[PDB]
Each structure stands twice: as structure tokens, then as C-alpha cells.
């Protein structure tokens, strides 16, 4: 299957060497990006109707409802809004898949897949850091990635040798702009 033999080591392959007002923002643009694929999936409902049959991830609700809870410990809540760099990415995102569907959606999954594998450290250490009590939503496991992984292995089944390049290649360019939104 494609994710265990061809994704998951292109990946490994690809391994080489803030106050509170901020982490709100953090959350939005994170809301905003997840959002954003979820549009791109339903705007072209019948070319990833295996991920929407597949039915909806838990990740965007869970980010709204820890957006709701972190603005009830912020002063000027109201105020922030998606970040600058976050909407250069959502129109990125468009545009990506607007050329080609499967360059975005490698950008969609690595999207899922980093956050998975960073956030429980992350939010933790950030809420540790900024005396936030509450444990957030979106820092549970609610196999969103595994169904991913599970709807690319059916997906890849009906793609050329070239569409699985293009997705494979495409991970890499999702893997560095991934980093730059980190600060």
C-alpha cells in the first residue's frame, strides 16, 4: 500500500541539517489553513469524494471550539484576526490546487501529518508557558491523519506512475513551507 512503502519513507527521506494575543493568532491561522482544505475538498466535491465519504476530520472543530475557549483568557479577543503570512498560504493553497489537485493535496496531508506529530509537544509546552489551565481539542488524537493515510492508499490505486511522482515530489515543498510558519 502506498502511505506504509512510498509516503511515510519519502518523508523520513525528507529529514536533513509569542505572548497570548500571538497564540490566538497562532489557532486562527491554523483554524483558517484546515478550513481552507476543507473548501478545496468540497469545491471539487467529485475528485476527493473518497475523503469526504470518507466523512468530515474532527481537526477544524476542534480548533473553532479551542479558538472560543483560548479568546475567554485573552484581553482584546475580538481584535486579532488571520495572520498576514496565513492568508499569502490559504491563496497558495488555491492556487496549487487550481493547477494541480494532487499537488495540493500533498500539501493538505504533510499539513495534517506535522501538526499531528508536533502538536501534543507543542500546545502543551506553549499552554505550560502562558498559564493556559484548560487542555485543548485539537491536542487529541481523533485518528484524523489515519484517515488520511487510509484515503490516499484507495486514491493512489487510481493514479499513474506520474500522479504518484507529482504527490511524492510535492511533499518536499509542503515540508519547507510547513517550517516557515513557524515562529
Known sequence: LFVRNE???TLAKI??????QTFLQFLMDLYNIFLKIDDLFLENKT??????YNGPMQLTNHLYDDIIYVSSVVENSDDVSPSEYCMEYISHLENLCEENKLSFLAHAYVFYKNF??????????????????????????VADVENFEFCLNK????????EKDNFLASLHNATNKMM???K
Open 15 to 20: 529529514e536533513n541539517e509569542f505572548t497570548r
Open 180 to 182: 516557515i510558519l513557524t
Open 116 to 141: 499531528h506529530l508536533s502538536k501534543e509537544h507543542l500546545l502543551k509546552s506553549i499552554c505550560k508557558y502562558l498559564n493556559i489551565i484548560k487542555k485543548l481539542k485539537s491536542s487529541t488524537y
Open 47 to 52: 475528485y476527493f469524494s473518497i475523503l469526504i
Open 155 to 162: 486514491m493512489s490505486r487510481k493514479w499513474s506512475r506520474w
Open 7 to 9: 509516503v511515510l519513507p
